[PDB]
Design an enzyme around this catalytic site. Structure first.
Site, PDB file in Angstrom:
ATOM      1  CG  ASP A 132      -2.145   0.980   0.970  1.00 51.90           C
ATOM      2  OD1 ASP A 132      -2.217   1.664  -0.098  1.00 51.90           O
ATOM      3  OD2 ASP A 132      -2.982   1.072   1.906  1.00 51.90           O
ATOM      4  NE  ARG A 136      -4.446   6.400   0.060  1.00 53.56           N
ATOM      5  CZ  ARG A 136      -4.624   5.189   0.619  1.00 53.56           C
ATOM      6  NH1 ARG A 136      -4.594   5.008   1.949  1.00 53.56           N
ATOM      7  NH2 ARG A 136      -4.851   4.133  -0.169  1.00 53.56           N
ATOM      8  CG  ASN A 137      -0.733   4.798   2.694  1.00 52.68           C
ATOM      9  OD1 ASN A 137      -1.609   4.564   3.519  1.00 52.68           O
ATOM     10  ND2 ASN A 137      -0.924   4.674   1.392  1.00 52.68           N
ATOM     11  CG  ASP A 150      -1.382   1.505   5.766  1.00 53.63           C
ATOM     12  OD1 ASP A 150      -1.907   0.713   6.603  1.00 53.63           O
ATOM     13  OD2 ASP A 150      -1.740   1.561   4.565  1.00 53.63           O
TER      14      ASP A 150
HETATM   15  N1  LIG Z   1       1.589   8.301  13.591  1.00 55.81           N
HETATM   16  C1  LIG Z   1       0.976   9.431  13.150  1.00 55.81           C
HETATM   17  N2  LIG Z   1       1.467  10.611  13.514  1.00 55.81           N
HETATM   18  C2  LIG Z   1       0.925  11.776  13.117  1.00 55.81           C
HETATM   19  N3  LIG Z   1      -0.146  11.867  12.322  1.00 55.81           N
HETATM   20  C3  LIG Z   1      -0.751  10.752  11.873  1.00 55.81           C
HETATM   21  C4  LIG Z   1      -0.219   9.440  12.265  1.00 55.81           C
HETATM   22  N4  LIG Z   1      -1.020   8.532  11.667  1.00 55.81           N
HETATM   23  C5  LIG Z   1      -1.975   9.205  10.962  1.00 55.81           C
HETATM   24  N5  LIG Z   1      -1.819  10.543  11.103  1.00 55.81           N
HETATM   25  C6  LIG Z   1      -2.602  11.662  10.499  1.00 55.81           C
HETATM   26  O1  LIG Z   1      -4.002  11.447  10.394  1.00 55.81           O
HETATM   27  C7  LIG Z   1      -4.316  10.966   9.093  1.00 55.81           C
HETATM   28  C8  LIG Z   1      -5.117   9.686   9.271  1.00 55.81           C
HETATM   29  O2  LIG Z   1      -4.663   8.641   8.412  1.00 55.81           O
HETATM   30  P1  LIG Z   1      -5.466   7.256   8.506  1.00 55.81           P
HETATM   31  O3  LIG Z   1      -4.962   6.265   7.491  1.00 55.81           O
HETATM   32  O4  LIG Z   1      -5.439   6.810   9.937  1.00 55.81           O
HETATM   33  O5  LIG Z   1      -6.970   7.768   8.153  1.00 55.81           O
HETATM   34  P2  LIG Z   1      -7.397   8.508   6.764  1.00 55.81           P
HETATM   35  O6  LIG Z   1      -8.549   9.607   7.047  1.00 55.81           O
HETATM   36  O7  LIG Z   1      -6.242   9.202   6.142  1.00 55.81           O
HETATM   37  C9  LIG Z   1      -8.041   7.242   5.626  1.00 55.81           C
HETATM   38  P3  LIG Z   1      -6.752   6.573   4.526  1.00 55.81           P
HETATM   39  O8  LIG Z   1      -6.166   5.315   5.066  1.00 55.81           O
HETATM   40  O9  LIG Z   1      -7.429   6.234   3.115  1.00 55.81           O
HETATM   41  O10 LIG Z   1      -5.625   7.687   4.239  1.00 55.81           O
HETATM   42  C10 LIG Z   1      -2.992  10.810   8.346  1.00 55.81           C
HETATM   43  O11 LIG Z   1      -3.067  11.046   6.931  1.00 55.81           O
HETATM   44  C11 LIG Z   1      -2.090  11.781   9.083  1.00 55.81           C
HETATM   45  O12 LIG Z   1      -2.169  13.151   8.671  1.00 55.81           O
END
Ligand SMILES: Nc1ncnc2c1ncn2[C@@H]1O[C@H](COP(=O)(O)OP(=O)(O)CP(=O)(O)O)[C@@H](O)[C@H]1O
Length: 256
Positions: A132, A136-137, A150
């Site tokens: 994946d 975005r990841n 991820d």
């Molecule tokens: N360890 C971490 N530290 C800081 N910010 C984080 C984080 N994990 C996620 N985030 C923030 O919150 C967002 C949430 O990502 P997540 O995958 O959990 O949900 P999402 O709304 O982006 C659906 P998708 O999986 O399709 O991107 C991330 O894009 C990032 O900006």
């Protein structure tokens, strides 16, 4: 039952960061070292523990400066938590579009693309497939360290998003480290277009058709010929003539 188990009393939770598709995120604080954390959480009628935690189970087996770090988990009772290092600038996608990252130069873009390579090359050499990989990841912290995140769909040696997926993976579900390189190719496009959406306008049905039939996105203006030459390498019709992450990395470290 195990050694990464963190007591729930020890984590606070201070604000929301993510949506509710099977569970949200939240920034928190680990009281016993006064460090910020990302807590991933599980909406309770979904997944199953097993399916939530394999992402953890994978991180347990990894250590590297461009791989977001697992701190631990609260599976003692619900909701389940997956605790990890907090990244102060969120997804790479966002960073490129907004905070500071919109207004930066090509050397910045390059070196942040090498960090992804670096992390991927480690995954390669440890026989891992991410599956994946995209902007975005990927996450961003301070002084623009970039890390890869991820590991939900990660394996050792199924649904998906069309535009980051290699034609062999789409047609036959032959997924491999070389399909991950395809994605890096797409990632690169995303980086060098300050976070644009790939194959602008096309249905995703058009894309399956066009890319299996040989099509590839044109170079976008802004982007060093050098780098575009490398994207195309990652988009080689045939898996096994795409670079290793090793080679990819090396390439990036060359170059003005
Ligand atoms: N360890 C971490 N530290 C800081 N910010 C984080 C984080 N994990 C996620 N985030 C923030 O919150 C967002 C949430 O990502 P997540 O995958 O959990 O949900 P999402 O709304 O982006 C659906 P998708 O999986 O399709 O991107 C991330 O894009 C990032 O900006």
């Amino acid at each position: 039952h195990d050694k990464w188990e963190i007591p729930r009393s020890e984590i606070t939770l201070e604000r929301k960061l993510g949506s509710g598709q099977f569970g949200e995120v939240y920034e928190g604080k680990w009281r016993n070292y006064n460090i910020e954390v990302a807590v991933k959480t599980l909406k309770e009628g979904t997944m199953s523990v097993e399916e939530f935690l394999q992402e953890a189970q994978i991180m347990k087996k990894l250590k590297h400066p461009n791989l977001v770090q697992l701190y631990g988990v609260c599976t003692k009772e619900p909701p389940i938590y997956i605790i990890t290092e907090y990244m102060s600038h969120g997804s790479l996608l966002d960073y490129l579009r907004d905070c500071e990252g919109h207004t930066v130069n090509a050397q910045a873009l390059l070196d942040m693309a090498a960090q992804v390579a670096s992390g991927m090359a480690y995954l390669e050499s440890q026989n891992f497939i991410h599956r994946d990989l995209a902007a975005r990841n990927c996450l961003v912290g301070e002084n623009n360290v970039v890390k890869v995140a991820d590991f939900g769909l990660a394996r050792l040696i199924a649904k998906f998003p069309i535009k980051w997926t290699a034609p062999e993976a789409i047609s036959y579900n032959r997924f491999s480290i070389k399909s991950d390189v395809w994605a890096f190719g797409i990632l690169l496009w995303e980086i060098f277009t300050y976070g644009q959406v790939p194959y602008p306008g096309m249905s995703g049905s058009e894309v399956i058709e066009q890319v299996e039939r040989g099509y590839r996105m044109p170079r976008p203006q802004g982007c060093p010929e050098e780098i575009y030459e490398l994207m195309l390498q990652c988009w080689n019709k045939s898996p096994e003539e795409r670079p290793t992450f090793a080679e990819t990395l090396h390439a990036l470290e060359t170059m003005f």
